[PDB]
Design a protein around this ligand. Structure first.
Ligand SMILES: CCCCCCCCCCCCCCCCCC(=O)OC[C@H](COP(=O)([O-])OCC(O)COP(=O)([O-])OC[C@@H](COC(=O)CCCCCCCCCCCCCCCCC)OC(=O)CCCCCCCCCCCCCCCCC)OC(=O)CCCCCCCCCCCCCCCCC
Ligand SMILES: CCCCCCCCCCCCCCCCCC(=O)OC[C@H](COP(=O)([O-])OCC(O)COP(=O)([O-])OC[C@@H](COC(=O)CCCCCCCCCCCCCCCCC)OC(=O)CCCCCCCCCCCCCCCCC)OC(=O)CCCCCCCCCCCCCCCCC
Ligand SMILES: CCCCCCCCCCCCCCCCCC(=O)OC[C@H](COP(=O)([O-])OCC[N+](C)(C)C)OC(=O)CCCCCCCCCCCCCCCCC
Lengths: 49, 74
């Protein structure tokens, strides 16, 4: 149902790079010495009991 | 019951310890192979050592072979 009731950003016109929608997720996530890449999603560290 | 499910969940909490135990077992089975190969290492490298060290390491049993050449000069 939602696919035929929502609006979509790609159905609408923009002309300049400054008008592109802004990401929802924050830039400020990963930290530490000599870490170039500052953004990740998934990890496989194990769960507790 | 919560209690029983908790016990069943917790049964495997100590995975890493069991894996260390496995390390111990397999290394105990494996490590005696060092004796054959150690003897052969020493076998090959014995004639490279100084004559004195050959005499010492064999508690004086080993001595220069006697082939009837290079005897003393009066
Ligand atoms: C007998 C004589 C004896 C003499 C004794 C003299 C001793 C002098 C010792 C000097 C020591 C200086 C360093 C002090 C560190 C203090 C750390 C601290 O307090 O931590 C607290 C605290 C620790 O908590 P934490 O939880 O770790 O938080 C920090 C984060 O983890 C951090 O992560 P983050 O995510 O928050 O940040 C982003 C992250 C990640 O950032 C990035 O990845 C960005 C990278 C961008 C790179 C872009 C490069 C582009 C250009 C390339 C050009 C081409 C070059 C190659 C080609 C060239 C040709 C060859 O940034 C970094 O990783 C920063 C790295 C900085 C490296 C600085 C290295 C300094 C070396 C000094 C020399 C030491 C000796 C050398 C060896 C000697 C021989 C063994 O850290 C902080 O609060 C941050 C402090 C950061 C300080 C950095 C700046 C230090 C400036 C020091 C100036 C010293 C001047 C010396 C002059 C000497 C004159 C004689
Ligand atoms: C009898 C009845 C008949 C029975 C028949 C039963 C059937 C079996 C047969 C038995 C009968 C006898 C048969 C004879 C067999 C022996 C002869 C023999 O085998 O000679 C071979 C013979 C080798 O001659 P050789 O090499 O000139 O011999 C020179 C000697 O080895 C001289 O060399 P060396 O002196 O330089 O040797 C060095 C040696 C020197 O050895 C000694 O001097 C040892 C002395 C031994 C003493 C004996 C003790 C036992 C007796 C004690 C008595 C107990 C008394 C109680 C009982 C009675 C009273 C109750 O030292 C070592 O090896 C190293 C030392 C030990 C290493 C381990 C580390 C221990 C460290 C010690 C720690 C403690 C602390 C020390 C630190 C000091 C500070 C505290 O063969 C040849 O000459 C070569 C033949 C050519 C064939 C080439 C092979 C084929 C190659 C082609 C391959 C290319 C094709 C491609 C591959 C093809 C693949 C298929
Ligand atoms: C994993 C091991 C792989 C081993 C591969 C090695 C194969 C090649 C071995 C070459 C040895 C050469 C030794 C250099 C010294 C000169 C030798 C020489 O001729 O000297 C004169 C001597 C005789 O001396 P001389 O009479 O000419 O006068 C000099 C007198 N001395 C020696 C006292 C200074 O000749 C020999 O005795 C021949 C040398 C025998 C040594 C053989 C060594 C074999 C090495 C294998 C051991 C491997 C153990 C495992 C190690 C692994 C560790 C991770």
């Amino acid at each position: 149902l939602e696919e035929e009731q929502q609006r979509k950003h790609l159905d609408q016109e923009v002309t300049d790079v400054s008008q592109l929608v802004e990401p929802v997720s924050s830039p400020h996530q990963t930290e530490g010495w000599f870490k170039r890449l500052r953004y990740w999603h998934y990890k496989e560290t194990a769960e507790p009991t | 019951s919560r209690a029983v499910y908790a016990k069943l969940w917790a049964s495997t909490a100590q995975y890493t310890q069991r894996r260390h135990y496995a390390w111990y077992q397999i290394w105990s089975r494996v490590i005696p192979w060092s004796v054959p190969w150690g003897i052969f290492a020493m076998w090959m490298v014995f004639p490279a050592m100084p004559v004195e060290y050959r005499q010492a390491l064999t508690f004086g049993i080993w001595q220069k072979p006697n082939i009837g050449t290079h005897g003393p000069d009066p």
